[PDB]
Structure formats: structure tokens, C-alpha cells
């Protein structure tokens, strides 16, 4: 996260670190949606242009974390993956359309002060909250700058941007399954996700029922925190029928 701040203890208890076993490294963010299911970006697990193709055995899920590098004894939980499910129409060949994946854990994780699931939006939530100017929140252990690394989880709040402005900022073809967020050059404020943050959640707090909802997944960008560029996010609600189908079947 560029131009964010240190998270508070327990601020994002749904935050998940995807951790490569060999070599040991941060792969991506992700989120806890039940005791047994983790949500992330498909590009975190599968991207053939860069020869990325992770299997269940390649990585671990670390939950309840605050410190990036420390083994947080008596606090974090480490889980193994049973099965990865990538959206069958994930478009890595063109423009990263439908950038979403699920991971089922080998065993359910116990909830705690530090570990707790985020809500997924329904149609009404999406209609109420997904409006230009409305701010959401992005968290992760990724890069502090485009060109080091944080001691603890970082947080930044960012406004949803008008679709024409998103469209006009890039040569890439934007789909209804994506939205963009970030400040404009004229707005004075800054902030973005960066390398290490992708797959992680974009959340909003409903002012109607005071619950946090994951509206987005950190998907793609051009650099990090560049003037006139915006981060792009998978639209979670638009892909919820797929999410439900996978959880119902498996």
C-alpha cells in the first residue's frame, strides 16, 4: 500500500496472507469469508504469461496477522489448502476479466479477536454503496512505493471513480466486472495498492446495518499511485452467482 498508514490491531480481521512455501515469500492478499473459504484474485494463482501456476501444496494461508514477517505466536493461524477454484471464464488472455478465485481450507479456522469473516454484498448492498465518490478501504502487506516493505499491515481509504474517468485513464478494455478507485490529480490526496497487495479486499461499511462488506478484490493497475491512473478491482457482487455455485457444490 502506497501512502497509507499502519492498521490498528483487529482492524481487518478478515485479512489473509497468501504465503509461498519455497522460497518463503508474500504472494498476495486474500480474505476470510467463512470458517472454511478464502477469497482472492485469480491472477494470484494462475497467470500463464509469467509461468505462474500454483497448486494447493505450493502455498499456505496465514490468518489473524498484523506483523508482515514475524511468526505471531498464539495469534495467527496457519491453514493448508484443500482445493483451489478459479473462475472458468477468467480472461487472462485479454484484459483480466473475472479476476476471482476461491480456496477451500483443509480444516475450519477458529474465530477470535483477530480472525473473523467479512460479509459478501447482495444486490441491494451493491446498489446502495457502489457509487462514485463513496469511499472504501484497501489493506495489505505489499510495497510502500512503486520503485520498501512495511513492518505491519497497511490501510488506505479510497473513493470509487466515475466509469468514464476509469475508462479514459487506460488503453485496456474495461468490463462491467471491474470498477476503479483512487484520488484524481486535482484532489490533493493520494494512495493505492501495490505489489504484494493484490488479491486482497476492498471493503465498505454499510451505514444501514453497520457491517463491513467486501465490494472488490485488488485486481490490476499501471504502476502504483501514479497521477491520472487508478487501481482496478474485481466487482464481487457481479460474480456472486459463481461464488455461491462453488460453495453450494463443494
Amino acid at each position: 500500500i502506497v501512502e497509507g498508514s499502519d492498521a490498528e490491531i483487529g482492524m481487518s480481521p478478515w485479512q489473509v496472507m497468501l504465503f509461498r512455501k519455497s522460497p518463503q515469500e508474500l504472494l498476495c492478499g486474500a480474505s476470510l469469508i467463512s470458517d472454511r473459504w478464502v477469497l482472492t484474485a485469480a491472477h494470484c494463482l494462475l497467470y500463464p504469461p509469467w509461468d505462474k501456476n500454483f497448486t494447493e501444496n505450493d502455498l499456505l494461508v496465514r490468518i489473524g496477522k498484523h506483523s508482515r514477517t514475524r511468526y505471531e505466536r498464539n495469534i495467527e493461524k496457519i491453514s493448508m489448502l484443500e482445493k483451489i477454484y478459479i473462475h472458468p471464464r477468467y480472461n487472462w488472455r485479454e484484459n483480466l476479466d473475472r479476476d476471482i478465485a476461491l480456496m477451500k481450507l483443509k480444516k475450519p479456522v477458529a474465530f477470535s479477536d483477530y480472525i473473523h469473516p467479512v460479509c459478501l454484498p447482495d444486490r441491494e448492498t451493491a446498489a446502495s454503496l457502489l457509487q462514485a465518490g463513496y469511499k472504501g478501504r484497501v489493506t495489505g502487506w505489499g510495497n510502500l512505493k512503486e520503485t520498501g516493505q512495511p513492518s505491519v499491515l497497511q490501510v488506505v481509504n479510497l473513493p470509487i471513480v466515475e466509469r468514464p474517468v476509469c475508462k479514459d485513464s487506460t488503453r485496456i478494455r474495461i468490463t462491467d466486472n471491474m470498477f476503479c478507485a483512487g484520488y484524481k490529480p486535482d484532489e490533493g490526496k493520494r494512495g493505492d495498492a501495490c505489489e504484494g497487495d493484490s488479491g486482497g479486499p476492498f471493503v465498505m461499511k454499510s451505514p444501514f446495518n453497520n457491517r463491513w462488506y467486501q465490494m472488490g478484490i485488488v485486481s490490476w493497475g499501471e504502476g502504483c499511485d501514479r497521477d491520472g491512473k487508478y487501481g482496478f478491482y474485481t466487482h464481487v457482487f457481479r460474480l456472486k452467482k459463481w461464488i455461491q455455485k462453488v460453495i453450494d457444490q463443494f
Partner: peptide
């Protein structure tokens, strides 16, 4: 049933340092 309610914040009726910024942006 308990999704999205944080043990250290909503559950004990405490607010984090920047959640008000979000609320203030929800102007409809």
C-alpha cells in the same frame, strides 16, 4: 450471521481511527 462485525470494534461499540471518513463520503 455475525459477518462483518469486528470483535475489537463493532462488537464492543468502538470505532477505528478512519471509519468516519467512509461514513462522511456516503452522502446519499
Amino acid at each position: 450471521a455475525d459477518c462483518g462485525l469486528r470483535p475489537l470494534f463493532e462488537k464492543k461499540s468502538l470505532e477505528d481511527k478512519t471509519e468516519r471518513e467512509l461514513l462522511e463520503s456516503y452522502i446519499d
